[PDB]
């Protein structure tokens with residue numbers, strides 16, 4: 001390999017978004033540039049809307065995806081992933097004045113790979129509390145998949161970007177959402193968002209899979225091996241931890 005093109009979305013801060021000059025910035029951009037230097041490959045980042053990001057990769061419009069993409073079983077049917085470069089659970093989001101905040105969380109860390117009756121009881125409790133509450137999620141994400149598969153009785157609206165979800169939650173058009181802690185912690189830590197709060201169980205596994213990874217075509221085994229070696233080195237030397245603290249305000253490195 002000499003040169004590759006990496007697609008990102010550009011609407012998911014602090015992983016990938018646009019600066020004041022319209023340039024793509026964020027953890028995925030800084031990490032991608034560091035990995036390419038390690039691989040001795042020239043890389044160019046390009047913006048791609050979330051809906052077509054996977055088919056444009058398999059159609060050969062670019063060589064990899066770094067766009068806060070969870071390594072999840074459904075996507076693994078279509079593309080390959082590097083080993084994870086970040087780990088994060090998933091949790092809920094509402095407004096700081098919401099009555100939803102008073103709900104007792106019986107299971108703080110809720111793994112979904114093998115749901116026990118106790119874990120199902122906790123998911124069912126939140127489903128019942130959420131029935132009547134209007135949820136908003138970004139379309140085409142594990143957030144949408146979780147609500148449709150695990151909480152089908154809850155009213156959901158899907159959005160083109162997570163930015164539009166947050167806009168509608170702030171405006172009171174929706175009452176709650178779901179996303180990773182890696183997205184929600186920096187969002188709620190901003191003084192701009194003192195009116196927003198994370199809540200509920202922190203979920204992992206199941207349809208969410210594990211980790212955030214670089215999406216690569218299945219046939220590109222050598223490119224996956226190059227990324228895996230570079231990611232292992234960036235984790236080992238503390239680069240991923242450094243970038244995670246810079247962008248997220250905490251260490252989400254594997």
Ligand SMILES: N=C(N)NCCC[C@@H](C(=O)O)N1C(=O)CC[C@@H]1C(=O)O
Pocket residue numbers: 009010011012016050067068069070071088138140141142143162179180182183208211212
């Ligand atoms: N708009 C984007 N560029 N990416 C949205 C990805 C959301 C979600 C997913 O892959 O479907 N995520 C995962 O399930 C774990 C990491 C990520 C998240 O919730 O932050």
